[PDB]
């Protein structure tokens with residue numbers, strides 16, 4: 001059980017999320033067909049997440065709000081590609097939501113996923129569905145619903161991942177090129193990789209490098 005997430009647990013979630021995305025960067029690159037099939041979503045997201053991870057690793061804190069400012073700054077100064085910019089905006093909104101907190105419970109975690117979705121949609125001038133935005137939105141809606149009756153952040157994150165994966169598997173039904181080529185959205189897949197790392201960290205586990 002995880003009732004509260006402090007700054008070091010959040011840092012662990014960042015580090016293991018980044019490692020899991022790094023492990024899967026070639027896989028995510030291989031799916032990248034939209035907007036242009038230039039095969040770089042995984043690399044772009046990996047480089048972005050790595051910039052946030054390095055800032056965090058060099059400036060740890062027990063205070064989740066302070067650690068979030070560090071992570072957010074690292075992403076925003078290292079964003080690469082459409083996918084990396086969107087990832088940085090998703091977590092800018094997440095981190096802004098907890099800026100004054102030292103630790104957060106499952107309800108505030110869910111509210112922070114939702115705040116990130118709102119920030120990222122506002123940052124994209126013409127949002128398209130079937131994308132990283134769709135997956136993030138469906139994950140956040142799942143988070144809000146589950147957290148209402150679920151104190152344990154491990155159980156919450158497991159549910160978020162189940163529902164995020166259902167949304168990811170549905171992305172070809174929203175975006176024609178995905179169904180025509182036969183792939184799920186690369187940006188959403190990269191985000192799922194980060195969320196899977198989040199769960200490993202909540203369990204006190206490490207992603208194999």
Ligand SMILES: Nc1ncnc2c1ncn2[C@@H]1O[C@H](COP(=O)(O)OP(=O)(O)NP(=O)(O)O)[C@@H](O)[C@H]1O
Nearest residue numbers: 035036041044081082083126127128131132186187
């Ligand atoms: N308008 C959009 N709305 C939502 N998500 C988007 C949009 N445009 C791109 N994406 C996401 O960004 C991913 C592609 O990211 P990425 O490969 O990093 O883009 P890019 O290579 O930088 N730009 P491009 O060369 O124009 O395709 C997609 O799989 C979607 O998840």
Ligand SMILES: [Mn+2]
Nearest residue numbers: 036038040081
């Ligand atoms: Mn590109």
Ligand SMILES: [Mn+2]
Nearest residue numbers: 032038040041
């Ligand atoms: Mn690309």
